[PDB]
């Protein structure tokens, strides 16, 4: 599932930058894909009765770590300081050749 | 340790496709190794007083995302929909040159 | 943030082997960086009201899996058996070209 509730916590699946309706990427850019990832994540969090501010942990998996800065600049707009606990690294590849995938854990 | 209990949760280590008693891979194949990972994982879960059905989050680390389609269909037999929250990506390499590693978090 | 508290749990950000005050790597060695990661990690756990012995889950992201052995040696000194649940893999790259990143979850 996209999200699972356990007690105080909610666990979200790794989110790709897809249009919720179509299942296709919003574009090829890491910028649009990142933005879309954060938007989708917001939708899923709020559906679970959480929100951006109740997120306690995130993991950002990147296709290219060189995008780190711009990704971050987008990320910071959704998770401003104080931001959740975070880990970031470059993977060999992501599903559907995505540019970015973000997973997270939040409180209820 | 293979699993650590904390309140309502149990955290499992990343699991490779090894025959538990011998420490060796079931084969050099992703199919066999995935199936084995899921078996071992099951036994650890039930040893902790959990089970496949109480798993809230999983992470699948692959050596090759071409296997992702096969892996999925094996995975689906152990985690039928609605399945746990999940993240999947391809790493540079796994311990002991494994084809697949899976970690998870479950409820007690 | 470096650590987020949620009920019985605390979530730590991925930790690099940096001199905390200066933000610069302790060295370019994986050995020194591993040791430093673990120390910093201890600081962040203690400042949060937790400790090494209350850590329930770790994730070790390596730049080169050949370092595994020595890393695990160093790691073993900070998390002696019985040690936390753990996943380990090699990533394509880490932030600031680090040799090792370690994230963790502990109890309060």
Residue numbers in the entry:
A (entry chain C), B (entry chain A), C (entry chain B): 80 to 187
Tell me, in the authors' exact words, what the paper reports.
Therefore we tried both 2-oxoacid products for cocrystallization studies, and we obtained the complex structure of AtRidA bound by pyruvate. The structure was obtained by soaking the crystals of the apoprotein with 20 mM pyruvate for 1 hour, and the resulting crystals diffracted to 2.3 Å. The crystals did not appear to have decayed, but the crystal space group became P1. After structure determination, we found that there were three monomers present in the asymmetric unit. The three monomers within the asymmetric unit form the trimeric barrel, which is almost identical to that formed by the apoprotein, with an RMSD of only 0.27 Å. Pyruvate binds to the interfacial cleft formed by two subunits, but makes specific hydrogen bonds with only one subunit. The carboxylate group of pyruvate forms the salt bridge with the NH2 and NE atoms of the guanidino group of conserved R165, while accepting another from the OG atom of T167. Additionally, O3 of the carbonyl group receives another hydrogen bond from the backbone of T167. Aside from these polar contacts, the ligand is located at the active site formed by F147, L95 and P174. Additionally, the terminal carboxylate of E180 from the neighboring subunit is only 3.26 Å from the 2-carbonyl group, and hence it is very likely to play a role in the recognition of the intermediates.
Arabidopsis thaliana RidA (AtRidA) is targeted to chloroplasts. By converting the reactive enamine/imines to harmless 2-oxoacids, RidA preempts damage to BCAT3 and ensures that the isoleucine biosynthesis can proceed. In this study, we determined the crystal structures of apo-AtRidA and its complex with pyruvate, and analyzed its structural basis for ligand recognition. The RidA domain retains the basic overall fold, and also preserves the homotrimeric structure with the characteristic interfacial clefts.
